[PDB]
C-alpha cells in the first residue's frame with residue numbers, strides 16, 4: 001500500500017538533501033570514528049538521556065499528531081523543526097510489534113527505519129516555527145513514488161532477529177524471539 | 186525502457202561500490218548497508234532502476250520484500266573470499282528460486298578481480314553451482330568495482346537480454 005510515516009527532525013531539508021536523506025546517527029559516527037552501527041532494535045528503543053551515537057535506526061511516527069508530539073516533546077527548545085512525510089519501505093519496522101511486551105516506550109508507537117531513509121522516499125515536509133504548524137506541505141521534487149508505492153514496512157516477523165535484547169534477556173527464552181535467539185539465550 | 190534491477194549478495198561483496206560507480210562514475214567510501222540504497226542509472230537507452238539491499242545475514246530475510254516486479258538480478262561476489270563462497274552459492278539459489286524471481290535474468294559480478302588470490306570467473310561459475318543451469322538466462326562477468334572494470338560489460342549483457 002501507499003500510506004505514509006511522519007518524522008519530527010531539527011535538520012532542515014537542505015541539510016537532508018545534502019545528506020542523501022534522513023540518515024542514522026551511527027552513519028556519521030562510522031565515517032568519523034569507525035564505530036560499527038548498532039542494529040539492535042532494543043538499544044534503539046531504550047536510547048539514553050537522546051539517541052545513541054552509533055544508532056543505526058531512524059525513528060518515525062504513524063500520524064501527524066504523533067510526529068508533532070515528538071516535536072513538542074523531544075525537540076522542545078528548538079525554534080524551528082520539520083516534520084518529514086515519508087513513504088513506507090521494507091527496511092522499516094513497527095517497534096512495538098517487534099519488541100512486543102518488552103518495548104521500552106510503547107507510547108511512541110514508533111516505526112523505525114533500519115539504515116536510514118533515502119531522499120527519494122521523503123514525500124515532503126511541514127515546518128513548525130515556535131510550536132506553530134500553519135504552513136501547508138512542501139512537496140519534494142526528489143520524491144519517487146514508483147519506488148515505494150508497492151513496498152510496505154517489514155513485518156514484525158522479520159524484525160525479531162534484529163530485536164537485539166541483551167544475551168541474557170528473558171525474551172530470548174520466550175515466543176517468538178526464542179526462534180531467533182543467539183546461542184545461550 | 187525501464188528495467189528494474191535487484192542487486193543482492195553477501196556483505197562486503199562490493200554491491201554499493203558497484204551501484205555508485207555506475208551512478209557517480211567513481212568508487213566511493215561505503216558503509217555496511219543494513220537498509221537499502223536505490224538509484225536509477227541510465228546506459229544505452231535503458232533506465233536501470235537498481236536496488237542495493239544489505240547482505241548481512243540478519244537482514245537477508247528482508248531481501249524477499251524487494252522481489253515484486255524485478256526484471257534483473259545482479260548477484261555480486263567477492264572472489265578473494267573463499268570462506269564464504271559456499272554461503273554465496275546457497276543465497277544465490279535461494280533468491281532465484283523464489284516465486285517472484287522466476288522470470289529474472291541473472292547477472293553475476295565476479296567482483297574483486299584486482300586482488301591476486303581472487304578466483305577466476307570459471308571457478309566462480311562452478312563454486313556458485315550454476316554450471317548446469319540451462320533453464321535461466323545467466324552470465325558471470327569478472328569485475329573490479331573500484332576500477333570499474335567489467336561493470337559496463339555486465340550491463341551490456343543485461344541490456345541485450347532486455
Ligand SMILES: Nc1nc2c(ncn2[C@@H]2O[C@H](COP(=O)(O)OP(=O)(O)OP(=O)(O)O)[C@@H](O)[C@H]2O)c(=O)[nH]1
Pocket residue numbers: 194195196197198199200201202203215216217218219238239240241261296297298299300328329330331332
Ligand atoms: N579490492 C577490491 N575491493 C572492492 C571491490 N569492490 C568493492 N570493494 C571494497 O569492499 C568493501 C565492501 O564494499 P561494499 O560496496 O560496501 O559491499 P556491500 O555488498 O555493499 O556490503 P553490504 O552493504 O554489507 O551488503 C569496500 O571497502 C569496497 O571498497 C573490488 O572490486 N576490489
Ligand SMILES: [Mg+2]
Pocket residue numbers: 200201202215216217218239
Ligand atoms: Mg553496501
Ligand code: NA
Pocket residue numbers: 001002003087088089148149150151152
Ligand atoms: Na509504500
